[PDB]
Design a protein around this nucleic acid. Structure first.
Lengths: 255, 252, 213, 180, 226, 59, 41, 198, 304
RNA sequence: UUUUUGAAAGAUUUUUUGUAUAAAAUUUUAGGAAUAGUUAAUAAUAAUUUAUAAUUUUGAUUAGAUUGUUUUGUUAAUGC
C-alpha cells in the first residue's frame, strides 16, 4: 500500500541451499539482509590479513607516524571520549588513552636473538625512504573496524597524502619483507592499511567485554570528520607504552 | 521428469508446496513399520561381526538430566528382558504392527514379545523387542550376540533388543541405518576345510544330458477381461517388480 | 565427502606451513554485489558471481550458516501439517549453544516458532547450553534438528491444533493465537487465504519415505 | 491443462511442444497449393512462426515435366517429376540430434527422398501385417547368429564415433626427432 | 523418463504407450503413478436384478411400522448377499468367513492364475472398518515365486474379484505373527518337481491357434464368407 | 455416451461434468421445510403380519 | 486414438462411459501383432 | 476430463457431492445468508453458522452433532430387545464409529425374543451383522437362532434358513437340524445338561 | 518394499568394488609420495603387460592364459628390483606410512604377469608385511580390503576353465588342478578375511569368492550367492554369468533350466541387466533347456 | 509487454546439479505546466521508519488519436 509488491530489497535467492530444496522439500527462512550488508553499512576495514604463523605471534615492532602536540585529532578524539562516557559508563575501560595515540603504518614480528641488528638495517630502509619526503599532511575522517569490530580506529583518508605515504610504506614493506627477511605481518608485496586505533577489545577483555565493540557506542561517529593534520616523524617503536606513555621509541626519522 | 532448481515463486515465510514432514509416531503402527525392517539387518550384523555397543551387560545408568544426552539413538541387546530405570513399559499385541516382524523372525530366533516403553519424563521412548529361542542364523563365534551367551547356551535363550529415541521424530534421527554393513556367511565355506574335505568330491564339468527339458503344462490364454497391454500401461510386470520393457508375465 | 574432507585437509596443511607470506589482498578478490541475471542471489562462501578461475586460498570460515530444522504447523485448508522449516542462521565458530539459540530467537521472522523455549539436537542427542559449536563438531553441515518443549506431545490430541475442518472452534478459540487470525468464515475476499492440499492428495494414507500401497 | 480447452486444436502435452517436422501448406486453389516443409513445435500459436524452428524446404505436390532437361528416349526420365527442397543437414541436426517428431506427410516425402525408411502408413493394403511367434523367431536366431566381435563395432561406429584414426596413420601425429 | 518402452522412440506418438513413465510424471501429482488397476465401474456393478422382489429393510426401517415377516427378511438377507456376490467377493467378504481372518492364506484375483501371470498374495493382516467390506488388507505379495520382504498393503482387496482356496496349513492364529512365505530361489532352494516356474522374465507363450485363426480370418488370410 | 454430457454446460464438450447450477439449489428456499416427525405411537403399532402371527401362538 | 472396441468391457453404467478399456485376451493378443510390427518399424 | 481447473484446488478430488458450484460461490454475501439459512434449516445449532472457508463436505463435528441429536425412534421400549436395540443403534449406528459388531452382541439381541416383533428385530440385527458389518458368526449360532425362532414357534423361517444357508452367516449346520426341520428326524438335539431333546 | 533401496543419507546395497580409502596423490607428503611413485610405476608395468598380451590377461579365454608366456620373468625381476629399491632407499620412515596401495599392485603384478597360486599370494603378502614390520616396532599390518581383493582374484584365476571352445561344451581345466585343495585354501583365507573387522566386504571380493566356488565345482556357489550377495549387494550380471556355469553342471536339465529361470527372475527383481554374455550363455544350448533369451520385440527386429 | 526444465523432445541401475523477472536505444496533439498510495536506502520493517525524496519544458502528470520497432505505394532517389 506504500511501495512495490515484491520488493527487490527482499528479492533474494541463496545458492548454498541445494536445488529443489526450497521448491518441494523444505523451507529456508532466515534474515539475508544482514549477510548481504556492505562494508559501508558495517565498518569492515579490510586490514592486511596476516597468515597463520605471523598471526600466532604478537606485534613486536611497529612503524608509526607520530602525532604532533596541540592537535586537532587529539581534541576531537577528546570530545568523542566525553560522549562515549556520557553515553555509557560501561565503555571507559575499552577506549585507548589519549597519550597512546599514534598512527600505525605497519606491524612486524621481530626476533630478539637478532633484534638490534635487524632494527638497524630496518632503520636504514626507513630513513632511505623518508629522507627526501616532505612533512606529511593527512586526513582523519570516519572510523572503522579491525578484528571484526574488535578495534575501532580513525583511519587516515586516502584523500590528501595516502598516495605518497603508501608508495613509502609499501616500499619499506617490500624492504623489510623480501630484502631483510623480517616478518611484517602480510605478504612482502601488500600495503598495510595505516590506521589510528582509538579503542580496542583485547584478549584480556574478550571474556567480559566481548569480541565485537558495541556499534551503538560509536556509530554516531562512524562517518565523522576528525580533522586534517600534519606530521613530521616516522618512528619504529617497540611495543611497550608504559615507558613514558608513548611506546618505546626504538627509532625516529624527521621529515 | 527431473528436479527443478529453486523456489522462485513464493514468499518463503509461508511454506507452500512442500511435501510434508514425515513423523514416525509410536502410538500407531507406522513407528514399527519403519523401525521393523531395520532390526533385521542389525541382527545379521551382530550375527556376523562384533560391534561394540550392541551386547551390553545391563541398562545404562544416567541421571534423568543426561538420559536424553546419551540415550537418544541408543540401541542394544541384553541377555534377557528387563526394563531400564526411569521407564514404564506397555506391551503391544496389535497384529497390524506385529505383522512386519515376520521377516525378522523367519531369519532369526522368532520374536516373543514387543513393548513400547516411555520415560517418566514422557520424552524418551524405547521400542523393546524381546526375541526367543534358537536363532535361525549361523551366528559367528566372533559376533556380538555370540558373546551374548545365547548360541553358547542351549535352546530357550530369551535375549532382547532395545532402541531408544525421542518421540514424534522423523525417520532420520533413528540411527539404525548406520549398521548396514553387509558381512557374508563364511560358515558356508567352512565345509571344505574340516573332515568333509575328503568326503566331498566336486564335479567341474557337466554330465552328458541326453534328455531335453520336460515342457510346462500347455498354455491356456486368459479368459478375464484384461486391463490391456501392460507395456503401454506403464504397469511393472506384476505391479510389483520388473522392467516396463521387460514385460514378462503379464497375461501373455 | 571428497570435497569437505579434502578442503579440510588442505585448509589444515596451509597452517601446517609457516613459510607462507600471506595473501595479497588487492589480488584476493571479494564478491561482486552487482551482477547479471535478475536477483540479488547469494552464492557460497568460496564462490564469486564472476569468473575467478584461480584456486583461491582455502580460508577458515569465521561465521557458520547454521541450519535449524524447526516445526511449523502449517494450514493447508484440509488439516494442519508437519513440514520442514529450516532457519539458516549465520553464526560464528566460537559461540556457546546457549547464545546460538538466543541468536536463532532473534533471527526468525515467524514467531509461530519461538513462543516457548526450545532446544537443539543432532541425530537425537541434545546439545548442552554450556559448551560451544566445535565442542560437538557443528559445521554448516551438522544435520541438526530442533525440539520444542511440547514435541513429545504432538502424537497426542490435547494441544493439537483445533481446526475448523474437523473440530469445533468456540468463541475462546476465536481470541487465541493462530485462530484469531486464521480466518474461519470466508470474507468477500476470503481475507487471509492459506494453502490447500486435497483430502485425496497423497492417496488413501499419508506421506512416508517407504512405499505403502 | 486449460480451463476451457481449444477444441479442434489440442495436441498431447504442454504449451511449447516438442519439435515436429511438419509439412504445412496453405489451402488455396489446388493449382496454387505447395507445401512449406519445416521443423517446428507441436503446440503453436495460430500461425506457423512463433514456434517455427527452422524452415526445412518446400514440396510441389503437382508432378512437373522435364522442362529443364531435353527430350530423352528414356521413360523414367520423361515421367513427371515431383520436386522438393529439403534442408538435409539441419533436418539431420533436428531429427537426429535434437529428436523432433517426424509427422506422417513429411515422412511420406522424405521416405521418397531416401533419408528415412518408408513410413508406417505407406500401407501396402494388399499384404497383411505380420504374425509373431517365439518358436520360429528363436529358431532362426539359433540358425543364423552374429558375433559380439562383429556387433560391438557396428554398434560403436553407427551410434558412437566412427572416424577411426587409422592406427597406422596416427603416426603422422607422433612427432619426429627435433621433439622426438 | 526412467523406463519407457524400447528406450525413447518417436516413429509415432503411441510408441511410448498411454503413459511414458511407471513413475508419476509430476512431482505435484503423486497419485498418477501406474498401479495395476482392476475395473472399478464394472466390478462395482452389483446386479440389482437379484434384489428386486425382496422388500428390503433400511436402517431407518427399524420401526415396528416397517418390520417385515422374518421369512421376507430372510429373503432380504439371501438377496443382499447374492447382490454383493454378483460380480464376486471382496477380500473382506472372502476372509471374514475363513478362520483367523484368513491371515496366511494365499488369495488371488481371477487373472492371477490365468495366462503367464502366476501370483498370489500370501496375506499378512486384515483390519475391518465399522462397515465391513472395507478396511486395510496387508499381505506378503508373491509373484512368480518371489515375495516382498515386508507385508505391504494389498491393493484391490476392497474390489470384488477375489478368490482363495483355504488350506488348513496357512491358518495363522491371532497370536503368531505370519511367518512370511519363502521365495523359491532364496529362502527355499529350487526343485524341478515340486514347483516349476510358469514363465521367466523372458517368456512369452506360443501363439494360441484360436487367436491366430481369428486374426487370419479377419485380416483376410483365412477366407471368411457368411 | 456423448448425449449424457451434452446436457452439461462444459463450454467445450469436455467429457467433464460441470453441474449446471440452478438459482434455487437448496430446499431452504425451494419451499421444502423440515421433516414431519411421525408420531412415535404411529410407528409403534404392531404390523399386521406380526399381529396375525402373534395370535397364532395360543394354538 | 486408443480404440474403443465394441467388444470391450461395457461399463453398464449411466454416469461415466458406456464402453471402457478392457480387452478380451484376443485384443491383448491382437494388439500384439499391432505393437511389434511398429517396433520392427 | 479433469475437473482440476474448473473448480478451486482444495476441491480437487471431490466426488459424490452434488453441484459443488455453491461452495465455490459460498463467500459472496448473498450466498452467505443463503447458507446461513440452509444451516439453520438443517438445524442442530442455535447461533448462525456456515460451513467454513473451504469446506463442501460439512464439518465432521457438526455432522456428528446432528447425527447424535437426531432422535432415535421406537419411543416405546418395552421388551428386552427394544432396549437392546436402542443401545445397539447407539453403538454401531452413532456417527463415525470404529467398533464393528460382535457375534457375542448379536447373541444377546437374538436371545431377547418374546414376540414375532422381537423376532423381526433381532433378525434384522442378524441382517446387519451378516451384511453390514462383515463379521463371523460363532460355531453354534444356528442353535441360538433355531431356538430363537421356536420362541415364536416359527418353522418356515428356519427351513428357509437351512435351505439357503450359505448366504446367512451359518456355515456349520449339523445334519440333525436339517433332518429335523424336514422331518427326516422328528427331533433335532438332546440338551445334554438335562439329557433331553429340545 | 521388494528390495533394499540405495538411499541418499545412507547406502544399503554394499559396494560393487573396493576403494583404496585414502587421500589424493597431490595430498601426500613427500615421503608417502615415494611409495606412491612405485605404485604408479607398477600400475603401468601391469598395464603394458595387458596391452602387450590381451589373450593372457583376460581370465579363462584359452590355455595361453594358463601357460606362463615367455618374457614375463625378466619384467618381474625389474619389478622386485624397484621393490627392494624403495625398501633400501627408505628405512624407518618406510614403515610409518601406508604401503597397502603398492602392496596390492605387487600382488596383482606377480598375480597376472606370473601364474602362481592364491596361497602363494597370501604367503607373499605376509612376507611383505613382516618384512616391513620388523623395521621399527613389534607389530604387523593387516591387509586391507583391496589387498585381500588381489588374494581372491588369484583364487579365481586359479580355478578357471576353457569352456566354450569352438563347439566344446566341456570345461577345459588346468593340467592337474585340484579343487579340494583350492577351496580349502579359499575357505581358510576367507575365514581370515571375515575375521578381520576392518575389512568391509564388497561385490568385487564376493564375486571372486563365488567364481571360486564355481570353478571348484562345489555345487554350493549359488547358495553362497543368495545368502551372501544376491539380496544385499548392488550386484552385477557377472555374478550370474559365472553362476550359470554352475547351474549347467547338474545331472538333470529339469534342474538346470529351472534354476536358470529363477536366476532371471532375480535379475528382473533386483534391477540387473542381463549382459550379452549372459544371454549368449543361455542361447548356446537353449535348444536343450528351452529358456527363451530375447524379448519379443528384440527377436522380431533381429529376424526382420 | 519482459521471463526457465521442472512439463515435453528425452534415450539409464539409484539419490544429480550452477543458465530465468533486468533492461538499453526510439514515443504522438498549434498555441505547453504542473503531477502524485509517492524516490533511495535500510527491510525478507515501518496501515504513524528514516529524508534537503522522486517526474517534468531534453515538453511531465490529466485528457485526445493511436496495436510498437525485416512485409507496401509512388519516386532515379535521401523521402513521403
Amino acid at each position: 500500500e506504500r511501495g512495490l509488491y515484491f520488493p527487490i530489497n527482499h528479492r533474494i535467492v541463496d545458492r548454498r541451499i541445494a536445488s529443489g530444496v526450497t521448491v518441494e522439500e523444505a523451507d529456508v527462512q532466515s534474515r539475508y539482509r544482514r549477510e548481504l550488508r556492505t562494508s559501508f553499512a558495517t565498518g569492515e576495514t579490510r586490514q592486511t590479513i596476516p597468515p597463520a604463523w605471523s598471526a600466532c605471534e604478537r606485534p613486536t615492532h611497529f612503524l608509526s607516524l607520530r602525532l604532533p602536540v596541540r592537535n586537532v585529532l587529539r581534541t576531537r578524539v577528546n570530545e568523542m571520549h566525553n560522549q562515549i562516557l556520557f553515553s555509557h559508563q560501561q565503555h571507559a575501560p575499552l577506549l585507548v588513552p589519549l597519550e597512546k595515540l599514534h598512527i600505525t603504518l605497519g606491524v612486524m614480528a621481530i626476533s630478539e636473538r637478532e633484534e638490534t641488528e635487524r632494527l638497524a638495517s630496518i632503520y636504514d630502509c626507513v630513513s632511505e625512504v623518508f629522507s627526501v619526503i616532505h612533512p606529511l599532511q593527512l586526513r582523519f575522517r570516519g572510523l572503522g573496524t579491525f578484528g571484526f569490530g574488535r578495534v575501532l580506529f580513525i583511519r587516515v583518508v586516502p584523500e590528501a597524502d595516502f598516495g605518497i605515504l603508501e608508495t613509502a610504506v609499501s616500499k619499506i614493506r617490500r624492504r623489510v619483507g623480501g630484502e631483510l627477511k623480517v616478518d611484517m605481518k602480510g605478504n612482502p608485496h601488500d600495503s598495510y592499511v595505516p590506521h589510528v586505533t582509538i579503542a580496542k577489545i583485547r584478549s584480556k577483555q574478550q571474556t567480559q567485554f566481548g569480541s565485537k565493540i558495541p556499534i551503538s557506542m560509536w556509530v554516531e561517529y562512524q562517518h565523522h570528520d576528525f580533522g586534517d593534520v600534519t606530521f613530521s616523524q616516522v618512528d619504529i617503536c617497540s611495543m611497550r607504552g608504559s615507558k613514558d606513555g608513548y611506546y618505546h621509541t626504538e627509532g625516529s626519522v624527521h621529515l | 521428469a527431473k528436479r527443478f532448481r529453486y523456489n522462485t515463486k513464493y514468499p518463503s515465510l509461508v511454506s507452500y508446496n512442500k511435501l510434508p514432514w514425515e513423523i514416525l509416531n509410536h502410538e500407531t503402527p507406522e513407528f514399527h513399520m519403519h523401525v521393523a525392517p531395520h532390526y533385521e539387518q542389525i541382527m545379521t550384523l551382530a550375527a556376523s561381526t562384533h560391534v561394540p555397543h550392541i551386547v551390553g551387560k545391563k541398562h545404562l545408568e544416567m541421571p534423568p538430566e543426561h538420559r536424553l544426552r546419551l540415550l537418544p539413538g541408543m540401541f542394544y541387546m541384553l541377555d534377557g528382558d528387563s526394563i531400564p530405570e526411569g521407564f514404564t513399559a506397555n506391551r503391544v499385541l496389535d497384529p497390524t504392527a506385529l505383522q512386519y516382524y515376520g521377516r525378522l523372525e523367519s531369519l532369526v530366533a522368532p520374536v516373543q514379545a514387543v513393548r513400547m516403553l516411555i520415560s517418566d519424563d514422557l520424552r524418551i521412548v524405547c521400542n523393546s523387542v524381546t526375541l526367543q529361542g534358537p536363532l535361525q542364523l549361523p551366528v559367528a563365534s566372533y559376533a556380538s550376540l555370540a558373546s551374548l551367551e545365547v548360541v553358547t547356551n542351549k535352546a530357550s535363550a530369551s535375549f532382547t533388543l532395545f532402541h531408544f529415541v525421542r518421540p514424534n521424530r522423523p525417520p532420520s534421527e533413528l540411527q539404525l541405518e548406520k549398521y548396514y554393513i553387509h558381512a557374508p556367511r563364511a560358515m558356508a565355506l567352512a565345509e571344505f576345510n574340516s573332515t568333509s574335505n575328503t568326503s566331498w568330491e566336486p564335479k567341474l564339468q557337466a554330465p552328458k544330458r541326453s534328455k531335453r527339458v520336460t515342457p510346462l503344462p500347455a498354455y491356456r490364454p486368459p479368459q478375464s477381461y484384461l486391463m490391456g497391454l501392460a507395456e503401454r500401461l506403464a504397469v511393472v510386470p506384476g505391479s510389483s517388480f520388473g522392467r516396463r520393457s521387460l514385460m514378462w508375465g503379464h497375461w501373455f | 565427502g571428497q570435497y569437505e574432507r579434502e578442503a579440510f585437509e588442505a585448509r589444515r596443511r596451509l597452517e601446517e606451513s609457516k613459510n607462507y607470506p600471506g595473501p595479497i589482498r588487492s589480488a584476493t578478490p571479494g564478491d561482486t554485489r552487482f551482477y547479471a541475471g535478475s536477483l540479488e542471489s547469494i552464492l557460497q562462501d568460496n564462490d564469486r558471481h564472476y569468473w575467478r578461475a584461480v584456486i583461491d586460498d582455502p580460508q577458515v570460515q569465521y561465521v557458520i550458516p547454521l541450519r535449524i530444522r524447526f516445526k511449523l504447523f502449517t494450514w493447508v485448508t484440509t488439516g494442519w501439517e508437519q513440514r520442514l522449516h529450516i532457519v539458516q542462521t549465520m553464526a560464528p565458530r566460537d559461540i556457546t549453544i546457549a547464545r546460538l539459540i538466543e541468536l536463532v530467537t532473534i533471527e526468525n521472522q515467524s514467531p509461530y516458532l519461538c513462543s516457548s523455549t526450545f532446544t537443539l539436537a543432532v541425530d537425537g542427542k541434545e546439545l548442552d547450553p554450556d559448551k560451544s559449536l566445535s565442542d560437538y563438531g557443528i559445521t554448516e553441515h551438522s544435520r541438526i534438528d530442533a525440539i520444542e518443549k511440547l514435541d513429545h506431545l504432538l502424537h497426542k490430541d490435547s494441544e493439537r491444533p483445533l481446526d475448523w475442518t474437523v473440530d469445533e472452534m468456540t468463541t475462546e478459540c476465536l481470541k487465541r493465537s493462530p485462530y484469531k487470525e486464521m480466518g474461519m468464515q470466508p470474507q468477500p475476499n476470503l481475507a487471509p487465504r492459506y494453502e490447500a492440499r486435497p483430502k485425496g492428495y497423497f492417496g488413501r494414507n499419508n506421506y512416508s519415505g517407504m512405499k505403502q500401497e | 491443462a486449460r480451463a476451457i480447452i481449444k477444441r479442434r486444436t489440442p495436441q498431447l502435452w504442454g504449451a511449447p511442444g516438442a519439435p515436429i517436422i511438419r509439412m504445412r501448406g496453405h489451402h488455396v486453389v489446388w493449382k496454387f497449393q505447395s507445401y512449406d516443409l519445416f521443423v517446428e513445435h507441436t503446440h503453436k500459436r495460430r500461425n506457423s512462426d512463433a514456434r517455427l524452428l527452422h524452415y526445412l524446404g518446400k514440396h510441389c505436390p503437382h508432378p512437373q515435366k522435364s522442362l529443364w532437361s531435353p527430350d530423352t528416349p528414356v521413360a523414367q526420365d520423361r515421367h513427371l517429376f515431383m520436386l522438393t527442397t529439403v534442408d538435409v543437414d539441419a533436418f539431420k541436426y533436428w531429427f537426429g540430434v535434437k529428436r523432433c517428431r517426424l509427422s506422417m506427410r513429411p515422412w511420406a516425402l522424405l521416405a521418397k527422398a531416401g533419408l528415412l525408411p518408408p513410413s508406417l502408413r505407406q500401407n501396402s493394403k494388399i499384404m497383411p501385417k505380420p504374425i509373431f511367434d517365439k518358436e520360429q523367431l528363436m529358431r532362426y536366431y539359433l540358425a543364423n547368429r552374429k558375433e559380439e566381435a562383429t556387433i560391438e563395432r557396428e554398434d560403436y561406429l553407427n551410434y558412437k564415433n566412427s572416424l577411426v584414426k587409422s592406427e597406422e596413420e596416427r603416426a603422422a601425429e607422433r612427432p619426429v626427432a627435433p621433439y622426438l | 523418463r526412467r523406463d519407457a518402452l524400447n528406450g525413447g522412440s518417436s516413429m509415432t506418438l503411441g510408441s511410448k504407450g498411454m503413459k511414458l513413465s511407471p513413475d508419476p510424471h509430476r512431482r505435484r501429482m503423486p497419485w498418477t503413478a501406474a498401479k495395476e488397476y482392476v475395473p472399478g465401474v464394472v466390478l462395482n456393478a452389483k446386479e440389482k436384478m437379484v434384489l428386486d422382489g425382496v422388500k428390503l429393510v433400511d436402517v431407518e426401517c427399524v420401526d415396528r411400522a416397517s418390520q417385515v415377516d422374518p421369512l421376507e427378511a430372510l429373503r432380504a438377507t439371501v438377496a443382499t448377499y447374492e447382490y454383493n456376490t454378483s460380480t464376486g467377493k471382496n477380500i473382506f467378504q472372502l476372509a471374514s468367513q475363513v478362520e483367523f481372518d484368513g491371515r496366511g492364506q494365499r488369495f488371488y484375483r481371477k487373472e492371477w492364475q490365468e495366462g503367464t501371470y502366476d501370483k498370489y498374495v500370501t496375506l499378512s493382516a486384515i483390519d475391518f472398518n465399522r462397515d465391513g467390506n472395507k478396511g486395510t488388507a496387508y499381505g506378503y505379495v508373491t509373484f512368480h515365486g518371489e515375495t516382498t520382504t515386508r507385508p505391504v498393503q494389498i491393493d484391490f482387496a476392497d474390489v470384488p474379484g477375489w478368490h482363495m482356496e483355504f488350506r488348513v496349513e496357512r491358518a495363522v492364529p491371532f497370536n503368531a505373527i505370519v511367518p512370511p512365505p519363502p521365495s523359491i530361489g532364496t529362502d527355499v532352494p529350487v526343485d524341478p518337481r515340486s514347483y516349476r516356474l510358469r514363465a521367466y522374465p523372458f517368456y512369452d507363450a506360443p501363439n494360441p491357434p484360436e487367436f491366430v485363426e481369428r486374426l487370419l480370418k479377419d485380416r483376410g488370410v483365412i477366407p471368411d464368407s457368411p | 455416451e456423448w448425449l449424457y454430457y451434452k446436457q452439461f454446460k462444459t463450454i467445450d464438450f469436455s467429457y467433464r461434468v460441470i453441474p449446471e447450477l440452478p438459482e434455487k439449489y437448496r430446499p431452504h428456499q425451494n419451499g421444502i421445510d423440515q421433516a414431519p416427525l411421525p408420531d412415535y405411537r404411529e410407528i409403534n403399532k404392531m404390523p399386521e403380519w406380526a399381529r396375525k402371527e402373534e395370535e397364532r401362538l395360543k394354538e | 486414438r486408443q480404440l474403443r472396441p465394441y467388444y470391450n468391457l461395457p461399463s453398464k453404467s449411466d454416469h461415466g462411459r458406456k464402453m471402457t478399456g478392457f480387452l478380451t485376451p484376443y485384443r491383448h493378443w491382437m494388439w500384439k501383432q499391432n505393437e511389434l510390427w511398429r517396433n520392427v518399424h | 476430463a479433469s475437473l482440476r481447473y474448473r473448480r478451486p484446488y482444495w476441491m480437487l478430488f471431490l466426488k459424490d457431492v452434488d453441484n459443488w458450484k455453491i461452495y465455490t460461490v459460498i463467500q459472496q454475501p448473498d450466498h452467505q445468508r443463503t447458507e446461513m439459512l440452509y444451516q439453520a434449516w438443517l438445524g442442530g445449532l442455535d447461533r448462525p453458522y456456515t460451513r467454513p472457508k473451504c469446506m463442501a463436505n460439512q464439518p465432521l463435528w457438526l455432522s456428528k452433532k446432528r447425527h447424535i441429536l437426531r432422535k432415535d425412534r421406537l419411543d416405546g421400549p418395552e421388551t428386552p430387545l427394544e432396549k437392546y436395540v436402542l443401545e445397539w443403534h447407539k453403538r454401531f449406528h452413532s456417527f463415525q464409529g470404529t467398533e464393528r459388531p460382535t457375534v457375542d452382541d448379536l447373541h444377546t439381541a437374538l436371545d431377547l425374543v418374546e414376540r414375532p416383533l422381537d423376532l423381526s428385530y433381532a433378525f434384522q440385527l442378524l441382517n446387519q451383522c451378516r451384511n453390514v458389518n462383515n463379521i463371523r458368526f460363532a460355531k453354534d449360532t444356528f442353535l441360538v437362532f433355531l431356538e430363537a425362532c421356536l420362541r415364536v414357534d416359527r418353522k418356515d423361517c428356519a427351513l428357509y434358513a437351512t435351505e439357503n444357508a450359505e448366504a446367512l452367516g451359518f456355515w456349520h449346520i449339523e445334519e440333525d437340524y436339517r433332518r429335523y426341520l424336514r422331518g427326516e428326524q422328528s427331533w433335532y438335539r438332546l440338551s445334554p445338561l438335562d439329557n433331553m431333546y429340545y | 518394499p521388494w528390495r533394499v533401496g540405495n538411499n541418499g543419507r545412507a547406502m544399503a546395497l554394499g559396494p560393487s568394488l573396493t576403494t583404496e580409502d585414502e587421500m589424493q596423490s597431490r595430498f601426500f607428503s613427500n615421503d608417502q609420495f615415494l611409495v606412491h611413485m612405485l605404485k604408479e610405476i607398477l600400475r603401468i608395468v601391469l598395464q603394458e603387460h595387458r596391452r602387450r598380451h590381451p589373450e593372457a590377461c583376460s581370465r579363462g579365454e584359452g590355455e595361453a592364459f594358463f601357460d606362463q608366456v615367455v618374457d614375463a620373468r625378466e619384467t618381474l625381476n625389474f619389478c622386485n628390483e624397484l621393490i627392494e629399491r624403495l625398501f633400501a632407499v627408505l628405512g624407518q620412515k618406510m614403515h610409518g606410512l601406508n604401503t597397502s596401495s603398492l602392496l596390492s599392485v605387487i600382488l596383482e603384478l606377480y598375480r597376472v604377469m606370473g601364474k602362481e597360486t592364491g596361497m602363494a599370494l597370501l604367503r607373499r603378502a605376509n612376507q611383505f608385511l613382516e618384512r616391513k614390520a620388523a623395521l621399527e616396532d613389534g607389530a604387523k599390518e593387516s591387509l586391507t580390503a583391496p589387498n585381500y581383493l588381489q588374494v581372491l582374484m588369484g583364487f579365481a584365476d586359479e580355478s578357471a576353465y576353457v569352456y566354450d571352445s569352438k563347439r566344446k561344451g566341456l570345461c577345459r581345466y588346468r593340467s592337474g588342478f585340484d579343487p579340494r585343495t583350492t577351496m580349502q585354501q579359499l575357505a581358510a583365507t576367507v575365514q581370515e578375511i571375515a575375521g578381520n573387522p576392518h575389512v568391509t566386504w564388497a561385490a568385487d571380493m564376493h564375486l571372486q569368492v563365488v567364481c571360486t566356488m564355481v570353478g571348484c565345482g562345489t555345487m554350493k556357489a549359488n547358495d553362497y550367492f543368495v545368502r551372501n550377495v544376491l539380496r544385499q549387494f548392488c550386484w552385477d550380471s557377472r555374478f550370474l554369468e559365472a553362476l550359470y556355469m554352475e547351474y549347467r553342471r547338474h545331472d538333470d536339465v529339469d534342474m538346470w533350466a529351472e534354476l536358470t529361470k529363477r536366476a532371471l527372475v532375480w535379475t528382473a527383481r533386483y534391477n540387473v541387466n542381463a549382459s550379452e554374455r549372459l544371454k549368449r550363455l543361455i542361447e548356446d544350448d537353449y535348444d536343450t533347456i528351452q529358456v527363451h533369451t530375447r524379448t519379443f520385440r528384440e527377436l522380431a527386429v533381429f529376424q526382420f
